Amino acid sequence: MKQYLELMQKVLDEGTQKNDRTGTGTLSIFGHQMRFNLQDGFPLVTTKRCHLRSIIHELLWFLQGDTNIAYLHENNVTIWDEWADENGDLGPVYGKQWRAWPTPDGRHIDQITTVLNQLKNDPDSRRIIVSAWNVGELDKMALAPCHAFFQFYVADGKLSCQLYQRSCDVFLGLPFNIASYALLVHMMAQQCDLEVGDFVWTGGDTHLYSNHMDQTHLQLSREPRPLPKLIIKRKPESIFDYRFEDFEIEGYDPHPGIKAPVAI
Amino acid sequence: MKQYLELMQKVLDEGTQKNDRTGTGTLSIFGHQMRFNLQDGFPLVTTKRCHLRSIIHELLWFLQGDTNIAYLHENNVTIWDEWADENGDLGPVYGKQWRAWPTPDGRHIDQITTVLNQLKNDPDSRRIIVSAWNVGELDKMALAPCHAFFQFYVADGKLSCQLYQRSCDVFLGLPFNIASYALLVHMMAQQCDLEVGDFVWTGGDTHLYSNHMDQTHLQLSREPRPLPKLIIKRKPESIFDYRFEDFEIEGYDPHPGIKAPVAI
Ligand SMILES: C#CCN(c1ccc(C(=O)N[C@@H](CCC(=O)N[C@H](CCC(=O)O)C(=O)O)C(=O)O)cc1)[C@H]1CCc2cc3[nH]c(CO)nc(=O)c3cc21
Ligand SMILES: C#CCN(c1ccc(C(=O)N[C@@H](CCC(=O)N[C@H](CCC(=O)O)C(=O)O)C(=O)O)cc1)[C@H]1CCc2cc3[nH]c(CO)nc(=O)c3cc21
Ligand SMILES: O=C1CCN([C@H]2C[C@H](O)[C@@H](COP(=O)(O)O)O2)C(=O)N1
Ligand SMILES: O=c1ccn([C@H]2C[C@H](O)[C@@H](COP(=O)(O)O)O2)c(=O)[nH]1
Ligand SMILES: [Mg+2]
Ligand SMILES: [Mg+2]
């Protein structure tokens, strides 16, 4: 997609070489923002084929508050495999913080339910926020939340969402991150009888891995195809009652998939 | 400053008329980013005189984990008066989260100390993060955190910082928010023997109050002057040992101050 390729090029042009936790090395910029008007189409990267089924199942999984990968494995989704322990656990990552953020009282806050209620009851609120950045639980997590903090906004009957992503593997992660949040916005907008507005993506450490460079140069040579259209085939009774079969992506005409290794 | 006036003008032009918590009424946009290279000058707004005394005191007060306005009152800094209870308490707002984020353990995490330790010891970390957004404490706070989430980055000997601000009163708050985080970066840079890099400001609900409209037109009519330069007079033993007297601003030649009422 145009903004995605622009970002990729910017990292090449303006990124600094920078070592990384994984061992591999990156070109990195700090601070970036892109906007996707979800009325223009569903922002699924077309310059390579993305594994939408993994994106859909992963979001459904977050929404269930699940942090054991058994569900992903039941649906043949492997993107979380490297960080799961022997029992399939990842610790209290996104799903847990989204549905059951823990507090001293032995209490738990369902941020997704809260945000739904704000959207329905108080859409003008300026604190329609979900955070996965539970400082007190970070060391229990297999991996620190990357898509850390997001906020919704309503105007002119349209639901917008801004994500703050602290760290972004532009080649592997970002297409998943964009589509996942774009999908959540549609779902939430459906539940709240709103139209979809913008997804605003904001990045912190935004990088290309040194061993994704061939892939990146290949992708940059490709022309973006028109955005597909997301169809939701029914209206589940709540944001928690969706199933994989509810979604169809129409007119997704991507260029071929490009293989690249995840830096563990 | 050019980027500040540009934003102000953007809100006026593109902003949606929207109701708000305080009942004042606003023009609002969602999602905006600005970048200040702190090497170019200290980003203290020049198209009106800004009260750096209040910015410094609030920051020292944050860093002490203090959440009672008593220290602010003592130095005649009155910005928080509207929200304190009788005993001067604001509840567990920024200072408490920054210094003593309580965990479900009887434990307290000091995020400022962790960030310094990260900067000194693991500067390439992509999770040098402070969050004020403690979901389980929000109901006890006098005000939900505005400047909610921030992240540091180190490249080329320079410390950059990105703030995610969920809600931003562009006329009153933003100039303080910008200066406050710019000052913080300088202090952090100093305490980590780094230079200053960029301050990246990212906004969620970014707005102008209907009753700051005369003030905004005044300010928009004024040409920015050169940015001032921050002087720190000594180097304290830690990030926690700074005193209001440590700070001089040189070459600040603002247009006259512009009065505006806060929306309580
Ligand atoms: C954003 C996001 C969701 N995640 C992903 C997403 C995609 C991937 C991934 O490896 N994608 C590849 C493979 C996708 C995939 O599973 N494809 C199936 C399986 C193919 C295969 O087995 O390789 C298929 O094509 O049939 C791709 O997009 O081509 C890995 C983690 C998270 C899980 C934890 C994680 C660690 C990550 N670490 C790193 C460091 O390189 N980068 C990430 O982007 C990254 C992303 C994630
Ligand atoms: C960003 C920030 C820090 N804050 C401020 C900062 C400044 C102000 C403010 O009223 N500033 C005025 C006065 C600044 C000031 O301290 N002036 C005194 C004036 C004398 C006095 O009255 O004491 C002086 O120069 O000495 C101004 O910049 O023109 C209010 C809150 C926070 C504290 C809680 C808060 C609520 C806020 N509410 C609202 C809704 O309109 N907007 C905010 O920007 C806002 C900002 C804040
Ligand atoms: O540091 C700050 C504090 C908060 N504000 C403004 C933003 C809002 O206009 C107001 C907080 O109101 P709410 O968003 O919670 O409804 O204060 C700001 O601009 N900077
Ligand atoms: O949703 C995600 C999760 C992770 N990453 C990438 C960013 C980094 O390359 C890596 C995580 O490494 P750290 O930032 O935690 O070091 O995975 C993403 O792009 N999106
Ligand atoms: Mg894999
Ligand atoms: Mg005042």
Please give a structural write-up.
Chains A, B: (6R)-5,10-methylene-5,6,7,8-tetrahydrofolate binds at residues 51, 169, 263. Chains A, B: Homodimer. Chains A, B: GO terms for molecular function: magnesium ion binding; protein homodimerization activity; RNA binding; thymidylate synthase activity. Two copies of one chain form a homodimer. Chain A is 28% helix and 25% strand. By secondary structure, the first copy, chain A, is α+β, with helices and mostly antiparallel strands. In chain A, helix 2 packs across helix 6. The site of one magnesium ion (MG) has 3 residues of chain A, from loops.
Explain briefly what this protein structure is.
Two copies of one chain form a homodimer. By secondary structure, chain A is an alpha+beta fold. The first copy, chain A, has helices at 2-14, 52-63, 70-74, 94-100, 111-121, 173-191, 213-220, and strands at residues 16-18, 26-37, 101-102, 108-109, 129-131, 147-155, 158-169, 195-209, 229-232, 247-250.
